[PDB]
Structure formats: structure tokens, C-alpha cells
Design a protein around this ligand. Structure first.
Ligand SMILES: N[C@@H](CCC(=O)N[C@@H](CSSC[C@H](NC(=O)CC[C@H](N)C(=O)O)C(=O)NCC(=O)O)C(=O)NCC(=O)O)C(=O)O
Ligand SMILES: N[C@@H](CCC(=O)N[C@@H](CSSC[C@H](NC(=O)CC[C@H](N)C(=O)O)C(=O)NCC(=O)O)C(=O)NCC(=O)O)C(=O)O
Lengths: 237, 230
């Protein structure tokens, strides 16, 4: 019964028995594609193009109320009923709990993982994103650099928190988890796409560098970083 | 493990070591947790972490709360009866809901909708309303270039619209009062009261947000939690 969800009018399901992903390769979108690749859950990816204002369409918003990617529609949700969901961090937790992977069953570790996920969702994403605005997008042209410097300094502070935490450790929690999947695409985005490597003094965070490199070596990460592409759009036009 | 193993307790000793320890300040994020504790009826001992004194930047505080922020907790009666340290208001809300079996629906689909709205709060409402505070109420108000202010004001208006349209015909964010309401409404109150941003964000227009906020503020646990720690 996916036809009850208007999003499917705009991105029809070729495989309605599979989880539907509505996304774009961005630091938030790739959290979810990476997660799906890691856990081996079948899914059907759909490209939501910002160039066409797709994320502002009534069909998209009918599921993803905040007009943002990523969003999912899982036909095999609780009770075998479809589950609509947005917010990358909520989707990560949902998928971890659904699959039993990448979120510890040990309660204390569960909560430590959720803590670091929330740190990402409130700190890393929002603050690194402002560095992008003030160094890579329109804000880069603003002559008054006090705003830029606010967000750069805060991003450096957050990197320091990560760096100190990761000393002596492989991952944020005792096992690789959704907290890593949430954080490291954003670290990558800051130092690659936003061209902010020197601005945030990245070379001083040796532990973050080490763990980022380990993250990027993972085959599921390399796949998930690239998904969705456009091929799922072509037959429809 | 015993509570003295956590260096935070050197600076804020536990007078009641059998009780959950809260390290907080009356702020939109701190009151999420004090409100939650009041709602669920769990005993706790609150400690004031003074921003005026840079307490949140002390080594003792940071030893538990690694991001140097309030709120944080240390629950002696954590899972398996072992002490559990935790920071991030949204994580603490999930923890307390799961510990108490309150304020998350038994319907897992409703639980996930609730967690969605909690993440919307944690990534959108808190960070963006907080920037309106900086650029309207605190020192960023002095900046002659208003493009940053307007960026955050416009985004805050957009977020309020999302809430407002969602709340039409509803009492709460999910079908029952939940941790998502507790996360969101203290921030709405902060924006319009503390930051004096009521005209700035055109708050008058969000009739559903106003209605639900008013209901929220009538709850006794909310009134009590707003003032803790004193
Ligand atoms: N909390 C949400 C954030 C989702 C999100 O930001 N999605 C972006 C693409 S990810 S790309 C990263 C994203 N940037 C943007 O969205 C750029 C556009 C924005 N309106 C602006 O002016 O900065 C960002 O900084 N995010 C901060 C964070 O993660 O907390 C989107 O759909 N934008 C469409 C739109 O805005 O119309 C989540 O985790 O899912
Ligand atoms: N994600 C964390 C956020 C916690 C948080 O922001 N705590 C504040 C007090 S709540 S008061 C609201 C808070 N403001 C501030 O923290 C003001 C100081 C800041 N450094 C600045 O320059 O703006 C804010 O805007 N928060 C955004 C959000 O909730 O996402 C704190 O301890 N600050 C100490 C410090 O910065 O040294 C959570 O949910 O627990």
C-alpha cells in the first residue's frame, strides 16, 4: 500500500517490497546510504534534486515535513505496515534497531552511542554547515568575518572534543556504530567539499585524521558516499 | 564502579548518592531534563553549573561532560545497577524515557515519529533559535551586517512554520505528550521570552505553536522544571 503516500507519485517504487530512500549525496544523505550499505538491507534509492526544487515539492513534503533530505518510506515497518521517517539521525537509530547492527545491545553502550549521535546532530552538522556557508557558499563574500570566525572557532572546538575522545580508540563507542556513520561524512565534507582544511587547522587533529581515514577505507562507506545517482530517474524522465 | 570514581563529583559532591545527579542550569537545554525528571517522578539531586563562573569549562565538569555543555547526568542506578554518565539533552531524554517506561509511545511507529521530531529539535530548533539569540539578544546584535541575523531569523521562522502546520488539529507532536514536546517547547519559550524575539520571528502568526506552548507551560512539572537548579 505504498500508493497511500503521495511521495511515491513523484518517485515511483520499482521495488515496493524494499525500503525507499529519498536522498542526495550530501553529508546527511550519505549517513543513510552508508548505513544501508553497511547492514546489507535491500533498498531502492531515489534522487531528490535541489536544482529542480524537488525537496520543496508537495509530494516530497507530504512525507518529509521539514523539506529536507534524507527521508525514507519502509514498507516493512513496525507491524509490517509502512513507516515514513525523516531526520538522518532518527533514520540511523531506526535502521540500527531494525537490523540489530551498529548500535550496541549493551545498555550503557547504547546510551553512549546515542549521546555521540546527538552531539553530531546538534553540534557537528549544524556548525560545520555554517562554516560551509561562510567559507564556500554565499557567506564567503561577506566582508565582516566575525560570523565566519564564530563558526570556524566552534568547529575547531568540536574537532578538539572528537580528537581528545578518539585518542587510544578506534571508534566513538566500543564498536563501530551509527555515531561514526553520522560524524565522519561531516568531517569529510568540512575538509574536502568546503575547502576548510586550513581554516580549521585540521592537521592538528591527528586522532580525527586517523579515524576518518579508517572510515573512508570501508567498502560500504565508499558505496554509500555516492548514492543516489540519477539512473533511477531516467526511465520516468 | 562508585560515584567518587567520577571527578565531576569532586566539584559537585553528591549529598544524596543514591539519587540521579543532574548538572545543569535553567536554560532551554537544561530544563528539558529537569522537566523530564519532574514529569516521571524520579528522585534526583540538582547541581548548578554556573556559566558566570565558567564552571562548564572546568576540568572536573568536562571529565564527564566532554563537550563542556549542560545538561549532563550521572545516574548511580544505571543499567545493571552501575553508574551511568551521560550528556546531550536529547540522549538524556531517551535514556530517562527508557529507564522509566514513560513519555514514549508503546506503538513503535509513534516512538519513531517522536524520535524524528526530537532530532528535528536537536538539529534545527536548538541550533537555529540559539543563533537568533546571538544575533539579536547577545553580542552579535552589534554587527552592522544583518545578513547573518536574517539568515537565522528566516530559518527560525521556517522551522516555526513546520511546527505550526504539524500541530494543526493536534495536542502534541505525537499522539501522546512525549519527550519531543519536552525538547521543543522550552526552546520556543526561550526564543519569544528570553531573547525578546517575538516580533522579530513574527511569532503572532503561529497560532498552533502558541496554543501548544501555552498548554505546555500550564503543566505543573513544566513550571517546576523551568526553575531547576535554583
Ligand atoms: N537534521 C537534518 C538535516 C538535513 C539537511 O540539512 N538536509 C539538507 C541537505 S544535507 S547538505 C548540508 C546542509 N546544508 C544545506 O542544507 C544547505 C542549504 C541550507 N538551507 C542553507 O542555507 O545552508 C546543512 O548544513 N545541514 C546542517 C545539519 O546537518 O545540521 C537539505 O535537504 N537541504 C535542502 C534545503 O535546505 O532546502 C538531518 O540530519 O536529516
Ligand atoms: N546539544 C546540546 C546543547 C547543549 C547546550 O547548548 N548547552 C549550553 C547551555 S543551554 S543555553 C542555549 C545555547 N547557548 C549557548 O550555549 C550560549 C553560548 C554559546 N557558546 C554561544 O556562543 O552561543 C544554545 O544556543 N544551544 C544550541 C542548541 O541547543 O543546539 C551550554 O552549556 N553552553 C556552555 C558554553 O557554550 O560554554 C544538548 O542538547 O544538550
Amino acid at each position: 500500500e505504498l500508493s497511500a503516500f503521495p511521495i511515491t507519485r513523484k518517485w515511483p517504487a520499482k521495488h515496493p517490497e524494499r525500503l525507499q530512500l529519498y536522498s542526495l549525496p550530501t553529508p546527511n544523505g550519505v549517513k543513510v546510504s552508508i548505513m544501508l550499505e553497511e547492514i546489507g538491507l535491500a533498498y531502492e534509492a531515489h534522487k531528490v534534486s535541489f536544482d529542480n526544487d524537488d525537496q520543496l515539492s508537495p509530494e516530497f513534503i507530504s512525507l518529509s515535513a521539514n523539506n529536507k533530505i534524507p527521508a525514507i518510506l519502509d514498507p516493512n515497518g513496525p507491524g509490517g505496515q509502512p513507516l515514513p521517517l525523516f531526520e538522518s539521525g532518527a533514520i540511523l537509530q531506526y535502521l540500527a534497531e531494525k537490523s540489530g547492527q551498529l548500535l550496541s545491545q549493551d545498555p550503557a553502550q547504547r546510551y553512549q552511542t546515542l549521546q555521540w549521535l546527538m552531539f553530531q546532530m546538534g553540534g557537528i552538522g549544524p556548525m560545520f554547515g555554517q562554516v560551509g556557508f561562510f567559507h564556500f557558499f554565499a557567506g564567503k563574500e561577506y566582508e565582516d568575518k566575525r560570523p565566519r570566525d564564530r563558526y570556524v572557532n566552534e568547529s575547531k572546538r568540536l574537532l578538539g572534543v572528537l580528537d581528545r575522545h578518539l585518542k587510544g580508540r578506534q571508534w566513538m563507542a566500543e564498536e563501530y556504530s551509527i555515531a561514526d556513520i553520522a560524524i565522519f561524512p561531516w568531517v569529510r565534507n568540512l575538509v574536502e567539499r568546503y575547502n576548510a582544511r586550513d581554516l580549521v587547522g585540521f592537521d592538528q587533529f591527528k586522532e580525527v585524521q586517523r579515524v576518518l581515514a579508517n572510515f573512508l577505507e570501508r567498502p560500504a562507506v565508499q558505496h554509500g558516499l555516492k548514492i543516489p545517482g540519477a539512473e533511477n530517474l531516467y526511465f520516468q524522465g
